[PDB]
Every structure is written in structure tokens, then in C-alpha cells.
Amino acid sequence: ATAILRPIGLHVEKFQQTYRKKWRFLTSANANVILAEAASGERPARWALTTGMASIPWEYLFFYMSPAEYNRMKNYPGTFAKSASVRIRTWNTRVAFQTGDTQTANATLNQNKFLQVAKGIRSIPFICSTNRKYTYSDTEPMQPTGFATLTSYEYRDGLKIAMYGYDNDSADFAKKPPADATGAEIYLQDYLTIYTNDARATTGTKILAGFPPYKNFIEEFDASACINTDVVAMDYDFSYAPLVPQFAPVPNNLITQNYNASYPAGTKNEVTAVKTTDSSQATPPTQVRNAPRKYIQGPNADTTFFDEEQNYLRVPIEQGGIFEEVNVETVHDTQMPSINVGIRAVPKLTTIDETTQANSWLDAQGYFEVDCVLTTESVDPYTYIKGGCYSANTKSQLQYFASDGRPIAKVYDNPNVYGRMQMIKTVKP
Amino acid sequence: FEEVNVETVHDTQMPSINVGIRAVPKLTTIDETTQANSWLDAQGYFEVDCVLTT
Amino acid sequence: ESVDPYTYIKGGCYSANTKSQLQYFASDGRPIAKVYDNPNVYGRMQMIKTVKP
Amino acid sequence: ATAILRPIGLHVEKFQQTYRKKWRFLTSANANVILAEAASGERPARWALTTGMA
Amino acid sequence: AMYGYDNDSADFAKKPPADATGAEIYLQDYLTIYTNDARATTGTKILAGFPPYK
DNA sequence: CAGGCCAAA
């Protein structure tokens, strides 16, 4: 029999977008030295071991998309980041012909140059590491002598301004010609740092294990043979990266009496849980279901995380485990692999009278060409005939919140805890 | 220009040509995420052949 | 079909000015549009002033 | 020679959308009759011939 | 610079013609990209920055 | 990948 109607279902429009950037980065070949970091609050006294492996911030949205693209993206509710890709090529590595010292005839045409690549060091459970900005000595510019006070947020903000420039009405407009326009090189300042405990003032039983042998977890190549070659190629598929919240549904409490109904979940976990661990071992690991949560669209929505533009440069793109959907969901913890690349410090051609590492270095600089692609997807659903887009309420989203109203998000800036990236309260910009 | 006959005329322009060398940053450290603020002297050498027929 | 063009780095979408559009207007400020409701004139659909809803 | 930059041009995103409807219409089989329409302003007096073609 | 001065010029020796010598000439005209300066603009400002000319 | 626009061909 002829069918005059068939179940065609909803009209839903899906939109895929792609964002590409090309960056050229300059890195300094820092010496590996030990710096003391004094105790401060809950931070214990510790030793820090510096490197020249600059952090590549491929985990953040500004790395892939301009302020104009970001501003336009807010007009597409339900936008999810789907995949991110990065390719790193190295160019010729420059090493100074001589050092500043005049007493030694240290100039030499012969060079030994080495390129260092570290993938996924951030997640190694027994290596405590972060990316830090150093201060350097005036006589030895390759030698860190302390820590800059710049935060990770401020570092990424400065990188973003270098990439995309100021507003046309800024008094400081001329200070940063946008590399997205010129294609000029940008200096990176955030370097992989390895920590270990400082037991000088420790009372009772001391842990005297020294350092982890972190060189056993990096790749090091002859830089003379890597000119104009790819050294890193990484692809990442996001688990849950909601960049713009979904369209709100038509609220069923306006239509139904049973809007606050209950139903079986069986043995399935449909509400996520928060895991807390304690490496001091004063308390055992705990798992708590039904964390404080807020809807991010709809009647009582709290959109602070998206209103504050946290996901542009302050927090990583991947946020799996931080958000919930009201359906029968399966959620796991997430983290993107870290990327650090750089040039090993080049010792100055001179004699020393002891069996030690070098104490003076030649100026050396890495030149890295970075390609990056980000793909996203958004939806325009029409559940109802009038009044714009509305999604099914099974698409409704929630976000972890703290009791003071601050949204909670994943952060990659702190060292891993049991190989995990912690989630912390966001800070208002 | 016009000619008095039954003419067909459109707007014109020749394509522009610009060539050069990108600035070469000086080998030095700076303490911020910016472009270079000091450069090495660098110079492009271009050999140009040109033919015009009339 | 619609387009999101990015001619500039900041401040949202901007198109090339060769995409700029104009519409016929009457002297009283009413936009002019085609209408199909009137009979054809020499086989043509006339354009008339729009009326405010 | 290896090209570090190529003219990729602008980023432009194109979006195609489709709209479907199904309608069922009832029409009346009108008689073809002649109605007089009186003159009004610039409208001249005329005869009108009706149809059932909706 | 290409073709030199007249033989009676007081400045004749200053520019030996490159059409005769084949020597190199320095160019001084460079591509420049403009954008609006909204520091003193009143009302609605256009804050789009620069076009990505690279 | 240039010549009266490019997101058209």
C-alpha cells in the first residue's frame, strides 16, 4: 500500500569546521642545572632540574584558531572539538661561533648539536615535572638561575597576543605584529623541569633517592642531520570537548507532572564519580558519586565557564570526565599527551680541572615549524515547530562545580598524580 | 581610451610583483614570547630579464 | 547556502567588499521588491514598494 | 626548494541546509462564471472569469 | 640609475648607468600592509586587527 | 595560486 507519510524523524543540521595555523618557534638551548625552590604553603622544599625542552601548547584552543574564529564559534551551540593534529618540523640549528669570554680562545667552527624530543612525559607517574619559565644569568645566558613568577595563564596569554596581536585601539598596538599575519618567529619561554625532594631540612626518615633518570624517556638526535625534517607528528581524538553548550531542550516540567521522576539504573553507573587520592598516604583513595553539578543550558543554567571564555587559552580543550549528559552515559578520565622539543646545551670549548659537566655554554637556538589543524562539529536540532532550535533533553549537559560557584575543569599545568591530570576550580579572568 | 568604432572595452590592471628576503633574527635570547627585536643584515640578489614587444 | 568568511584575524567574520550588497529603495525609505500578485506587464513581474507589516 | 609558506588563502566555511515539508490541500471545484469588478482609482472596470485552479 | 645622466650634467659621474656596466642597483620600495588605527575613533570601532597576509 | 571579486569557475 502507498505510504503518504513515513517516519522521516527530526530535521537536524550538522556543521563541520576546520581551523589551521602555522607557527615558527625559537627555543633556547638551556643548560641542565639544579635550582632550589623553597617551601611555600603546601609546596614542600624541592630541587628543580632545568632543561631546554620547550612546551608546545597544542592542548589549547588559541593554538588552532584566531580570536575572530573563536568569536564566531560562539554562534554554534553544541560545538564539540573532534580531533586535533600537530606536525613539527625543525630547521637549521644555530650555535654561536664563540662565547663572550675574551681570556679563552674558545671560538671553533666544529659543532656537536643534539635535538631533544619528549612525548608524554607529563603523564609518567614516577617523574614529577612541570613547564616553567626561568630567569637566566647575564654572563651565561644559557644558564637558568631562578624561576620567573609568570603563571601558565599569563604565559599562554602572552603567546596568544604574539600570535594574533592587539586591538586596533590599543596604546600598545605596535609592540606585537601578529605572527598570524607576518609569519615571523616567536620565542618560547616555558621549559620542561624535573623536580625531586629537598631533604636538607627534613626531620626523621629522609628519602635520598636523587633524581629519576629522565634521559631514558626522551629521544635525542643529531641536529646536524635533522635539518628540514619532521620530528613530531601527533593526532588526538577528543573524548568530550564541549566548546559551546548544546541548545536547551523544551523543559518538560512545563508539560508534565512527573518531571522529577525516578527509574531504575540497574547495575550501570549513569552518574559519574570523583576520585581523590593521597600520595602522602594519610588517607586511602576514595570515590564519591553525585558531585556538585550545574546545568550549562536551560532554566537554571550556570554558563560561567563558557561566559568567561576559559577554554580559549586558560584550560585544555579535552575535558572528558568533567561533563555529564543525562542519558545512559559511559565516561572515562582523559588527558592529552604532552609535547616538549628543544636543543641540548652546547658546552663551550674550554678546559676545566674536575670531572663535572660543563659550566659555560655557547648560545644555541632551535628553529621549529609547527603545523596544527583542529576540526569541530556542531548541531542545529529542531524538536519543535516554532521558536528556534531545541534539542532532546537527553542531550542536556552538566558540569562539575565547586561549592563557591566556580566551575571545575581539568588542568595540565600541575604534575600528574598517579599518572592522572587533576581537576581544579577555575579562576575568574 | 576610446575609439570611434563599435568598440568593446573592459577595465584593466597588471599583476603586481614583490620579491624579497625575510628578516633574519639575531642569535640572542629574549625574555618574553615575542618576535625578534634585533636582526642580522641580509640582502637579496635578483637577476631580472625583461622583454617588451610593440 | 551561507558563508562564514575570515578576511581579518580578529573581531569575527568579515567578507571582501566585493561581496557588498545593495537593494533598490523608494524615496520614502521603503525597500522595493518583486511581487507575483499583480498581473504581468509585457510578460514581466513588476517591482513595487514593500509595505510595513 | 622546500616551501615553508604557500598561498593557502582565506579560511571560508560554507554551510548547506535543506528544508522539507509535506502538505495536503483541499480545493473546491468552482464554476467558471463572470463577475463584474467596478472601477476604483487607477483600476478600470473589468469582467472577471472564475476558475477552480487553486 | 639604469640609464645615467646627460653628458653635460654636473652630476654625471654620480650614477654610472647599469645598462652600460651591468652593476647592481639597490631597490627601496617595499610592500606595506595597512589597517585602521582606532585609538581616536569615536562611536563604533572596527577592531579586526590585520589581514593574515602571509 | 597573476589580468578589473572569489567564497564563482
Place this chain on the structure above:
DNA sequence: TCGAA
């Protein structure tokens, strides 16, 4: 076709 195919 006052490019020119």
C-alpha cells in the same frame, strides 16, 4: 575578444 582561450 581592447589577453585569450
Place this chain on the structure above:
DNA sequence: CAGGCCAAA
């Protein structure tokens, strides 16, 4: 040799 541990696969 990267993504919720690696000494598991």
C-alpha cells in the same frame, strides 16, 4: 616508545 599505570598487553 603519546590517551587516565606498566613492571599489564
Place this chain on the structure above:
DNA sequence: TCGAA
């Protein structure tokens, strides 16, 4: 399977 095979 909120990577994905």
C-alpha cells in the same frame, strides 16, 4: 566505545 580499534 565520551579515541578506537
Place this chain on the structure above:
DNA sequence: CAGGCCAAA
């Protein structure tokens, strides 16, 4: 070898 120019096609 002519018809909106011929030195254009």
C-alpha cells in the same frame, strides 16, 4: 574582396 572599421579575424 558586401552587413554598422580594418590595419581586427
Place this chain on the structure above:
DNA sequence: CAGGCCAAA
């Protein structure tokens, strides 16, 4: 085109 969501498969 139905059974714990569909815009997922």
C-alpha cells in the same frame, strides 16, 4: 524506522 537518547552506530 520498536527495547532505557540520537543528532551515536
Place this chain on the structure above:
DNA sequence: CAGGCCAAA
């Protein structure tokens, strides 16, 4: 046999 005329194509 419809879309800037049809008795033109």
C-alpha cells in the same frame, strides 16, 4: 507545453 515574449529557437 514552467524562468523576464513567441508568432524566436
